[PDB]
Ligand binder design. Structure first.
Ligand SMILES: [Zn+2]
Ligand SMILES: [Zn+2]
Length: 317
């Protein structure tokens, strides 16, 4: 339900003033990252668009082009993302994820498993308007099997809305799932895809709790964390998001920095795409579910301008 983001409109807003600052910072002989990141992070997406607008109206130049022309590395990637209109992010994220050789079966999961129905019907529309193609097809072209079917079920954005309680059905679903969730999720997929894919959230939250009574343990148990295939990966992403989306992203952020190296891509995708929706909740979850500070982690795992930004989007100290 209701959640807080980390980025909220800036006041007193002045696109033009902001536009010249960025220009001044980028123009001339040197590049003043400090100012740029202090501006893009404290200004929300709807404001970066206006800033971008003023920027051109005053200089005949293209703000985003100009940013890509002066910035580099991750700080560049971060900065350019926070600028990407909030309306095409997923569509664009999805395009560069199904484009060319090698398919990001993970970005497809994250997005299609976390976005809302309104948000998804939007993705589909954007993808056509901007790229002039069909997300479904472009999806069914790089996907196959039950994985694809589940991916497609989600794409429809027709999950059953929340409502009264059908105790009968909750027992039915729990059981039905359980059997197939003991067969290592390989026997009769069509049916658990239907249940996990379309039932209301309030309903599934409930099937989860009963299935806990039928098997003696949670459902995320049956599915191997890292191992398994894209389906299990998606089955697991669906369940996580039904329970608590913020919990889902805090876990994704956790694994993004834990271990060998750091999956900066995801870190950048998560931190941005959530900045104005639930990042402030994700932050609270992280701690509660990991006995560790999300901020301090980003703090101790990155550096430079790249870091200064992130830590702000993270909510500062
Ligand atoms: Zn691109
Ligand atoms: Zn708390």
């Amino acid at each position: 339900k209701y959640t807080r983001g980390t980025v909220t409109a800036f006041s007193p807003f002045d696109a033009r003033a902001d536009a010249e600052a960025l220009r001044k910072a980028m123009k001339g002989m040197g590049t003043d990252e400090e100012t740029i990141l202090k501006i893009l992070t404290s200004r929300n997406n709807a404001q970066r668009q206006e800033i971008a607008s003023a920027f051109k109206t005053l200089f005949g130049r293209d703000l985003v082009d100009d940013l890509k022309s002066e910035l580099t590395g991750k700080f560049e990637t971060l900065m350019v993302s926070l600028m990407r209109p909030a309306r095409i992010f997923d569509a664009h994220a999805l395009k560069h994820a199904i484009k060319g050789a090698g398919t990001n079966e993970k970005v497809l999961t994250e997005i299609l498993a976390s976005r809302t129905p309104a948000e998804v019907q939007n993705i589909k529309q954007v993808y056509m308007q901007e790229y002039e193609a069909n997300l479904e097809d472009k999806i069914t072209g790089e996907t196959s099997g039950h994985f694809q079917r589940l991916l497609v079920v989600l794409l429809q954005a027709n999950r059953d809305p929340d409502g009264r309680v059908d105790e009968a059905l909750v027992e039915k679903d729990a059981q039905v799932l359980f059997r197939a969730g003991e067969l290592k999720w390989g026997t009769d997929e069509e049916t658990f895809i239907t249940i996990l894919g379309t039932r209301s959230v309030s309903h599934l939250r409930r099937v989860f709790d009963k299935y806990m009574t039928i098997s003696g343990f949670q459902i995320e148990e049956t599915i191997d964390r890292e191992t398994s295939g894209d389906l299990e990966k998606l089955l697991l992403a669906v369940v996580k998001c039904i329970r608590s989306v913020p919990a889902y992203f805090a876990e994704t952020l956790y694994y993004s920095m834990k271990g060998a190296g750091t999956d900066d891509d995801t870190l950048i995708r998560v931190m941005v795409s959530r900045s104005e929706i639930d990042l402030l909740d994700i932050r609270h979850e992280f701690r509660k579910n990991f006995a560790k500070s999300l901020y301090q982690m980003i703090q101790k795992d990155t550096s430079g301008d790249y870091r200064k930004a992130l830590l702000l989007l993270c909510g500062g100290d």
